[PDB]
Amino acid sequence: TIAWLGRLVIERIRGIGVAALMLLQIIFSLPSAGGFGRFVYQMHRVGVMSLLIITVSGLFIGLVLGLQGYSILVNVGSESMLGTMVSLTLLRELAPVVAALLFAGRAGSALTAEIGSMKQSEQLASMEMIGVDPLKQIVSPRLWAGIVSLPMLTVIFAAIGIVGGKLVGVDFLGVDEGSFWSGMQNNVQFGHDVVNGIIKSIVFALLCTWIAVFQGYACDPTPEGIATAMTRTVVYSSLCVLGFDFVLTAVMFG
Amino acid sequence: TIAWLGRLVIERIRGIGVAALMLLQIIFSLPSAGGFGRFVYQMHRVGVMSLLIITVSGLFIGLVLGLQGYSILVNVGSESMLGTMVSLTLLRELAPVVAALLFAGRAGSALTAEIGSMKQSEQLASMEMIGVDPLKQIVSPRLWAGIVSLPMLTVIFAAIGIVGGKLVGVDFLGVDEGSFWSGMQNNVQFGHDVVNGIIKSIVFALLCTWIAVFQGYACDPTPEGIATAMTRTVVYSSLCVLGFDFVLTAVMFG
Amino acid sequence: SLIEVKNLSFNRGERVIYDNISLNIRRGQITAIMGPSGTGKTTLLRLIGGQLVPDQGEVLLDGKDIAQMSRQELFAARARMGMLFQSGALFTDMSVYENVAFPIRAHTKLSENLIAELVALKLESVGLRGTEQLMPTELSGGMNRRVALARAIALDPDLIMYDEPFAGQDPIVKGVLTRLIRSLREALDLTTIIVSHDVPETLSIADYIYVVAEGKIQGEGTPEELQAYASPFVKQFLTGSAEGPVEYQFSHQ
Amino acid sequence: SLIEVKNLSFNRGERVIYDNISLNIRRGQITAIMGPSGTGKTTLLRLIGGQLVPDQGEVLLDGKDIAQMSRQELFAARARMGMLFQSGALFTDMSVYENVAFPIRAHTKLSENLIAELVALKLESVGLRGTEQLMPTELSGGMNRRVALARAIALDPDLIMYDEPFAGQDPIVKGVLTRLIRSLREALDLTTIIVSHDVPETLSIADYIYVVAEGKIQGEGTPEELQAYASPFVKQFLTGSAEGPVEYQFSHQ
Amino acid sequence: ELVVSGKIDFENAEQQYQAGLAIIKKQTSFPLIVDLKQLEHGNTLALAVLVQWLRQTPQKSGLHFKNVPEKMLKIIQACHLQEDLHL
Ligand SMILES: Nc1ncnc2c1ncn2[C@@H]1O[C@H](COP(=O)(O)OP(=O)(O)NP(=O)(O)O)[C@@H](O)[C@H]1O
Ligand SMILES: Nc1ncnc2c1ncn2[C@@H]1O[C@H](COP(=O)(O)OP(=O)(O)NP(=O)(O)O)[C@@H](O)[C@H]1O
């Protein structure tokens, strides 16, 4: 009856312990430099194949911020405020979260599904007998592609969001280019409004990809488990991004 | 070489036409032929099971908005704005988007997988062989349970978000409470802004669930198809929500 | 009743799976279909008068064309069929009791008392009495097949189709399924269709066998007759010899 | 190579799969393992192969305890065996060339020119000379499986394991695989293990057979001896007979 | 006659291969029949080596092998039944 929940919680938490151990091995020892020349290939499916989604969302978010900012800011200071609010919002809160979640979706479920199949088909297992450690051959380049790709995407998301904001806020709705640009320069500091967006992005890139690899590399070889793993990678990295985003922003701007 | 893309575009658009046809066939209110106990049950999986995720997300978003609003407002010297901005931000832009993306999102993915599994397994084929039209048993209560559930979850998300906002903005950070509640009343209203938040969520609920059903159901039985469909639902659900969010907000508050 | 399929033609995925298939399913007899895998075996059964639409040809039940003739008859007519599709389907959200009971509700309006008794009788006919409240997902593989079969014979149908029941299994199970077919064909006066790759079992069960490959019938007969007409295709197929009209890819240089 | 398996015990979580299994894998002979579905046949091969940790069991390769081997000894030992897995285990991201070539890079440092020639020879030995540079996902069923085997024999291993080779459904394929096993067994002086289902095909291939069920050996012998000493479990198992020690739920009121 | 002989294994494959090529480079007179009796058995890469040599000169030039171990032939006869089995 009740003990059921008890057992569920106990096992899920044991699994986090396992994930921590896996992460340690993959990051801790990677001497096979000759085979890491392929991670550039792996990046194709994490980074290159995801620009379309990040770019389109960045444009819609920029345009939305432009319109909502404007309808509020006409009562307070659009001439000075569209610039400052569009750029701070995108650099501090949205590029690191919206790109992080779209990424967790598009790259995250695809990646976990792929590791999942590698395990389910027994293909991965056959490598143990050939002496090729699957963590160094299969997992390593996938985790690294995730680390590099999300941060570069995060920057693009914001770059597009700025275009979106200006396109409506300045060009269709009647605001000065001068004060838009100077306002942004007056209030946006590289140190640390641009820099903190990047730091949060690295944290999310590691946490989110780490989960996707871990769940794909599941214990139970049952077909039902692939769909379960895919749903869970989206849910867990999604909450983790929001949880960590809160703490990091609390420090960075508090 | 080049024609490859051309074939891809043509097939995806053909598929849209099929999806539109399916929606028309399912939407007629024909399910009254059987009991609705099935609906109540189905709501368990699409709605009730997701309350934990949406609640935790709402709390973190509320607290983040509180801290970011405050660190900007202290440079205006006008703290009454926490009430006005926490409320407008959540009611107009974030509850309808964050809830929609976490919803489908999780429910979106799980539903796609479940229907698709029933296709792959031959369960659906058997039902037609028996004589019970599967759209009235398998699809109908799933599409409607999704319609009712997301809008209801949107409200809870905002409600948690506002409370989280106050919890830091007023109670830890020293803001006189009376200006918070007054700021909310001045000038965002239950009869206008709350209403527009709900309307957007009805639209999103239909886009998200409609896509999730289609992706699961309408596919020839390729074994790799389930994982691909799950990823695809997340991507299309997400872009459709953002594309529509822009056009609707542009009217509601334009 | 007798089922006839004539001049069947069907194109799926721009490829022809079937080309002028002509079958005579003999009443009260076991009809079987054999052939290479991946050549339409499930498809051909579906085209018997299920949910697939042929491009050419006709499907006759009792000599009547099922296409168009009429809605109400066809709805009722459907109550005369039961099937095991591939691995066999069970609904995961329903108990065993409900999986067997299910098709009853498609054509009848009975009291809870009688629907319950029919389920009990049908489960005993396959050795499953007393497993009614377990969820099907907790059954061993041997039982999953038997539950699905109980559903198939739930309405006292005339035609039972077993889609590849012998394909891959445990020798104990093969013994049991063979016996259930022998028991039921007699007990219920059934006409049955067995479609299967495992030639050695089919050959001792069917009264009449068709060998189908590459969209055409490539020989027909009782198992005794098929052995008498050694078209290279049929002969290799029914013997397992690696020699015959099959290919390997090589050329030295 | 002679492989000793002694007092094998293995649990998967809390469930016991094996309980004091004792095997003698005879040099130059074909040995085989038969038994009911799901009783750990694959688990046993994985333990023999050293990929799982046995619980207090002893495994010896040419008399050497695998548990005591150094990293270099273990690594070198890997080049002594190859296996064909149940799904075929091909790598979808690589063309056939790499799928067969792949293990060569785990043990050797060869020029690209010699690597290419070995791939060509191994593909020819199984009738795949013409599939060079095609992606494996585009192969038909029989070809798909033959490629996987080519990988297993790529390094001229002493021992080849086949996990469910006769579970293929196509009579044509059964013909080809039977021949390849016999052909390769002789050409390369191999010791082989066949672990399968459907008895009409392992009883004519193996020189020696173990019958395994419920974690225990149920009898051993040559095909003739197993029949001679066919304890009822074994007898009905090998016969595919009904009324063996097989239960179903039953009680009535 | 100049022939390559001894144990061919993965460890010295590159060198045995090049030694044979050096012989081919100097093979201005042929047919030469290569005596493989002094060849350690059970190693298919030896065949890969012999074939690459065939691929440079013998396939057009008319060079052959003699006293070939029975095992090497069994490996060849797995499928190359069209081999030039003649001395
Ligand atoms: N609805 C569909 N639409 C398009 N392609 C499909 C569909 N379903 C399956 N496929 C293909 O159409 C055929 C499905 O039926 P079929 O050939 O009868 O399977 P089968 O012979 O029973 N398979 P198998 O049991 O492995 O031998 C195959 O050629 C599939 O590649
Ligand atoms: N880490 C794990 N945790 C739980 N289950 C696992 C794990 N790894 C593998 N499996 C087990 O692997 C076992 C493999 O043996 P088995 O179930 O008999 O399959 P099999 O040998 O291919 N069956 P068959 O084809 O009839 O011989 C299954 O029973 C699974 O539970």
TrEMBL record, chains A, B:
InterPro entries: ABC_MlaE_roteobac, MlaE_Permease, Permease_MalE. It is a multi-pass membrane protein. It is found in: Cell inner membrane. GO terms for cellular component: ATP-binding cassette (ABC) transporter complex. Its main location: membrane. It comes from the Bacteria. Keywords: Cell inner membrane, Cell membrane, Membrane, Transmembrane, Transmembrane helix, Transport. GO terms for molecular function: phospholipid transporter activity. The chain crosses the membrane at residues 18-41, 48-74, 143-163, 194-213, 234-253. Part of the ABC transporter complex MlaFEDB, which is involved in a phospholipid transport pathway that maintains lipid asymmetry in the outer membrane by retrograde trafficking of phospholipids from the outer membrane to the inner membrane. Probably responsible for the translocation of the substrate across the membrane. The complex is composed of two ATP-binding proteins (MlaF), two transmembrane proteins (MlaE), two cytoplasmic solute-binding proteins (MlaB) and six periplasmic solute-binding proteins (MlaD). Belongs to the MlaE permease family. This is Intermembrane phospholipid transport system permease protein MlaE. It comes from Acinetobacter baumannii.
From TrEMBL, chains C, D:
It comes from the Bacteria. The lineage of its organism: Bacteria, Pseudomonadati, Pseudomonadota, Gammaproteobacteria, Moraxellales. InterPro entries: AAA+_ATPase (IPR003593), ABC_transporter-like_ATP-bd (IPR003439), P-loop_NTPase (IPR027417). SMART domains: AAA (SM00382). Gene3D superfamilies: P-loop containing nucleotide triphosphate hydrolases. The keyword Transport applies. Keywords: ATP-binding, Metal-binding, Nucleotide-binding, Transport. Mg(2+) binds at Q86, E164. GO terms for molecular function: ATP binding; ATP hydrolysis activity. It holds the Pfam family ABC_tran. Coiled coil: none annotated. Residues 3-239 form the ABC transporter domain. This is ABC transporter ATP-binding protein.
TrEMBL record, chain E:
Gene3D superfamilies: STAS domain. InterPro entries: MlaB-like_STAS (IPR058548), STAS_dom_sf (IPR036513). SUPFAM superfamilies: SpoIIaa-like. Residues 2-78 form the MlaB-like STAS domain. Signal peptide: none annotated. Pfam families: STAS_2 (PF13466). This is Anti-sigma factor antagonist. It comes from Acinetobacter baumannii. The lineage of its organism: Bacteria, Pseudomonadati, Pseudomonadota, Gammaproteobacteria, Moraxellales.
